[PDB]
Amino acid sequence: MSPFKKTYVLKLYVAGNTPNSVRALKMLKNILEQEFQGVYALKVIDVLKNPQLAEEDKILATPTLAKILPPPVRKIIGDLSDREKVLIGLDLLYDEIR
Template sequence: MEPEPFPDFLDPTPADNGPEYVLHLYITGATVNSTRAVRNIKDICEQYLKGRYELLIVDIFQQPELAQQEDLIGVPTLIKLKPGLVRRLVGDLSDRERVLKALGLNAADGAPGHE
């Protein structure tokens, strides 16, 4: 006789709550500003959020319906969905200090700041 499996509520594996940071970057094709924004946010994520983030890059030329849902006022636009309050940054994300502040990060050591 085979042993009965554990019921779901007794599953000993911890629940996967997903990434700590969820970011959406809206761009317009391969323009200079869009390319720069992608490079800048990827650099920041790898330096400060390695293994703790999900980054979705949406080209509004390829997926205009997603851009319409967000009421974008300019592109490139980075939207931080979590943690904390939703934040929007418009531009090429080259002002690293401003981007880190919007993400709630401390530029000195990469540790999360206080929102």
């Protein structure tokens, strides 16, 4: 809870939020903050609200990074990408968070 925890940040860029994706993102969050405490932190970017990428941000196709993630995580990302159709892409960066 600070002074700033260093960890990888899994960033999901979504096209809006639906009842389903909200629930899925909730689950994804519990997974990372338990099964992978200190390894991965979740960061969600809604392009419907904040479309402009910051100078140091980037989006890679879901299938490109999804492959290297844990089974329970790939499942949820799969649901968000090919079932709900809200996932545009993702990124995985080491960074300091609170």
